[PDB]
Amino acid sequence: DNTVPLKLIALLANGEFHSGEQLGETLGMSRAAINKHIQTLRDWGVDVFTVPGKGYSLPEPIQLLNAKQILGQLDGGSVAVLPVIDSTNQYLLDRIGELKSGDACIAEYQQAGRGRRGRKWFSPFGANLYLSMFWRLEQAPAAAIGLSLVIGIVMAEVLRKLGADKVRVKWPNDLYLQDRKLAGILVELTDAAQIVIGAGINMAMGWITLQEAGINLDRNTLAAMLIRELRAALELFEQEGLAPYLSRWEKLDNFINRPVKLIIGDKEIFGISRGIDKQGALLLEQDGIIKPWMGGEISLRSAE
Ligand SMILES: Nc1ncnc2c1ncn2[C@@H]1O[C@H](COP(=O)(O)OCCCCC[C@@H]2SC[C@@H]3NC(=O)N[C@@H]32)[C@@H](O)[C@H]1O
């Protein structure tokens, strides 16, 4: 049961020192129990500083997700704000039968956040944005490439609009900053098709954060903007496909005309990227010849 640590971080969020005694009085608990639950916050990835014999404090204030503020500025779908969840993608999947296109979910903390191919996504409490959105496509796509490109484009453009000028996209589904992974996108597919989109963006916390690049964004504002723009963008993709996104992709293509490596299955091939075709397939030039690819993991190829 997570109610007591949640009430605890809710109090500690303002960055002010609280005594063990006053936290106990406020929460109607002993100082021993408080000390126990403080440790739980540490397990969740919260940086907590203990003043020996006196109490506790966060080193800095943290901005907690405000549901009322996020909901208030959005329209056209439900948005659930969850303090603790296993995975925002899974939360939407569990209820995929009662959801409408645009229904979204945001978590402070994921206990079982996942990347692609069964990997894990480190999702400490309050440090980053963990967002998911449900969408229904009336005609099922044959692949997740188009959707991923649309998500990556939109989230990059939003971050760029907010000051993160150098954010680029890694085909087909990661945002990169300074050639390092800033954000991860996971699209899960199931006549029509049901889609659960998942985005993890590193803010405060190989990898790179927005803060490590001097970008300090309002997490509530960022969440709302992403949800707002994704809904409209998915409507556009729904109506017109990838076509109106092709030029917008070129401006964000992080690996175009660069030497890259593509891990496909358990084969590893080398080539130079020439961008994408109209279907969003990677155009990889091997030995002077360009071939389209609708799969594989792309990465930079250099011993620099
Ligand atoms: N915060 C992190 N930042 C950078 N690298 C990391 C992070 N955590 C783990 N990694 C590394 O990346 C790999 C997994 O990332 P990915 O498969 O590229 O996965 C890409 C897709 C990620 C989707 C995450 C969102 S979050 C909200 C939603 N809910 C959920 O469970 N997934 C999505 C791991 O092997 C690990 O080494």
Side-chain angles (χ1 to χ4, degrees):
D1 197 316
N2 309 130
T3 56
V4 177
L6 286 169
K7 286 155 65 167
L8 201 51
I9 185 60
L11 288 175
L12 290 174
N14 61 15
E16 285 300 305
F17 161 88
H18 298 63
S19 73
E21 171 162 15
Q22 74 179 106
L23 286 175
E25 281 291 311
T26 300
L27 299 182
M29 298 175 72
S30 85
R31 288 170 53 178
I34 292 294
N35 187 69
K36 147 76 196 322
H37 292 299
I38 289 285
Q39 206 55 33
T40 303
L41 291 183
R42 291 196 171 113
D43 294 340
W44 291 358
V46 180
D47 188 10
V48 186
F49 178 84
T50 296
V51 184
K54 304 296 182 179
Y56 317 96
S57 179
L58 308 191
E60 277 195 279
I62 61 174
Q63 180 188 17
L64 291 181
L65 297 173
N66 191 309
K68 192 166 295 186
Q69 177 180 347
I70 293 173
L71 294 181
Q73 64 186 280
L74 297 172
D75 195 21
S78 66
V79 185
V81 179
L82 309 179
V84 180
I85 200 59
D86 60 340
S87 172
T88 46
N89 264 29
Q90 191 56 46
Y91 171 90
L92 293 185
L93 282 172
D94 289 339
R95 313 161 163 69
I96 209 167
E98 72 178 56
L99 296 178
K100 314 268 193 182
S101 297
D103 293 342
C105 173
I106 324 172
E108 291 279 20
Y109 170 55
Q110 298 181 131
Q111 285 166 320
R114 65 194 176 244
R116 297 181 290 268
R117 301 195 124 208
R119 300 177 219 116
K120 322 193 181 312
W121 189 259
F122 188 52
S123 308
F125 192 102
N128 309 294
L129 190 63
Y130 322 115
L131 159 71
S132 294
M133 178 174 297
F134 170 85
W135 201 270
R136 169 188 161 88
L137 287 182
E138 278 294 294
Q139 55 197 34
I145 296 298
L147 279 159
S148 303
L149 294 179
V150 169
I151 299 149
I153 286 169
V154 171
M155 298 201 319
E157 287 174 347
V158 163
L159 284 172
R160 288 193 60 171
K161 189 196 198 303
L162 284 171
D165 185 31
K166 298 299 183 300
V167 173
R168 302 296 209 265
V169 186
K170 178 229 78 170
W171 178 92
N173 64 7
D174 279 338
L175 304 188
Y176 276 28
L177 183 53
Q178 303 168 25
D179 287 326
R180 306 223 301 274
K181 192 198 279 290
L182 170 64
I185 299 170
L186 174 64
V187 182
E188 298 195 46
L189 309 192
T190 60
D191 201 341
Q194 292 178 330
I195 289 126
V196 177
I197 294 161
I201 303 171
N202 301 326
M203 301 191 67
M205 183 176 282
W207 37 279
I208 185 148
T209 75
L210 285 180
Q211 194 174 316
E212 284 169 341
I215 315 298
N216 306 282
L217 305 182
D218 184 309
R219 198 155 55 112
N220 291 311
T221 307
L222 174 56
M225 288 179 65
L226 292 172
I227 293 168
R228 180 183 303 113
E229 298 301 322
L230 274 196
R231 288 170 171 176
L234 285 170
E235 287 182 2
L236 179 58
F237 176 77
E238 199 171 48
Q239 297 165 25
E240 300 179 15
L242 190 64
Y245 291 93
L246 291 182
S247 65
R248 280 162 67 181
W249 169 259
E250 296 179 8
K251 310 199 179 188
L252 304 169
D253 195 341
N254 187 68
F255 283 118
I256 185 168
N257 301 316
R258 298 179 84 190
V260 299
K261 151 184 160 180
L262 189 68
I263 298 191
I264 188 96
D266 40 30
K267 312 294 156 45
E268 167 178 328
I269 63 187
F270 295 152
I272 295 123
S273 173
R274 300 302 179 185
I276 58 170
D277 59 26
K278 56 168 55 173
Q279 298 299 328
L282 163 68
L283 298 179
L284 185 62
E285 186 193 295
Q286 287 190 284
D287 302 323
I289 288 157
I290 298 174
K291 313 170 184 260
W293 297 89
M294 288 294 292
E297 297 181 55
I298 206 173
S299 64
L300 198 57
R301 189 190 92 234
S302 54
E304 298 298 324

